[PDB]
Symmetry: C3
Subunit: 154 residues, 3 copies
């Protein structure tokens, strides 16, 4: 059961929260201070921007630290306009009880560099309420992340 | 809370509506009259088809004009079979209150051209009810689009 | 309306079920015995693994046979860590009433091979309840699939 815009203000910790980011049933997460492009970490705050080269993917830290209640799933989709620019998001579930800045994979499938300003809206997260609190809210190894978090699989 | 097939007929404006497109909990949007492949706009109605070249993406206008109620989110996924053909969709949220034909990004990640007939089913949109109407239903710059709509970000 | 972890045990047929796969609001489907990489079928059980070459996609059979009730939609997302590794999932809806092992497209958008063990968690499926049973629960040509199922579109 999806949180409308007005329930998102009341019911999702979004820091820092941006009014222009609030969408009818979701929130435009913004480009944060960290990215990972071509094997290199980017200070997107310093550089002012992340540039996703043609046919490369970036890992982009959300500016927003997102804290989910134990009964809410974060469902993320690329901003339409980045899709229209050839960018594919590869997003995971934002598990109930998640707390942290999100590390987001965007793949520039186009032949043109795709540039995002620091603090630019790029992923709309929507919020699905669970039928009741998750028995085991998120306690995975990315919890509390405030930095670009790479794969811990290996 | 997801609309089953029977609630989709009653509760989503789908024009033109196709019975073969109605799925158990979603609707197979079909390939419309416009596409954008390799920097060029395609009259998919005229050509009869869009061909997504190996390792390229296309912007495909939906044949269907979709109008969402203010309490329903459009949640889009590639048809399974296009996924099985190497095609990746990059879809945005279809925001509550959306009205228009959808511009959809499909990336042919395969090495074989992926061809879609005009009017062929290619994206199943599912419909999530919001907990209550969005306070600010969709009023973004793509509203009412009846044509391939490119990125307005810049 | 999303099934929390505890409702997934009670309300989704998952065979074989793995406790480490159960997530706060979803289940980590695991890499099954079949894959399709570079035009070739892989016995992932025999090989012990599937290797997705740089910039290629694989079709991966889920280890789990998943049976959905007629009022539940399967909503699939890549494991976060595979996203962080440059992998893009292209998933369809898991339609209500689905019964079978899922054929999943993962695209390695990275320049490094992405390897998955047989039985390794790779896609978290979440379960959205429909507002009521689908009138026509899934009866498509992939129903009952227990093998990698390719595109039947043509």
């Amino acid at each position: 059961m999806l949180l409308p815009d007005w329930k998102i203000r009341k019911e999702i910790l979004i820091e820092p929260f941006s009014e222009e980011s609030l969408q009818p049933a979701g929130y435009d997460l913004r480009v944060g201070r960290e990215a990972f492009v071509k094997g290199k970490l980017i200070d997107v705050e310093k550089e002012g921007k992340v540039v996703i080269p043609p046919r490369e993917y970036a890992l982009i830290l959300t500016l927003e630290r997102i804290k989910l209640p134990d009964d809410v799933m974060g469902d993320m989709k690329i901003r339409s306009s980045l899709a229209r620019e050839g960018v594919i998001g590869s997003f995971a579930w934002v598990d109930p009880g998640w707390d942290g800045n999100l590390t987001l994979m965007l793949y520039n499938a186009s032949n043109e560099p795709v540039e995002l300003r620091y603090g630019e809206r790029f992923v709309q997260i929507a919020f699905i309420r669970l039928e009741g609190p998750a028995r085991n809210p998120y306690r995975g190894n990315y919890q509390g992340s405030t930095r670009l978090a790479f794969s811990k699989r290996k």
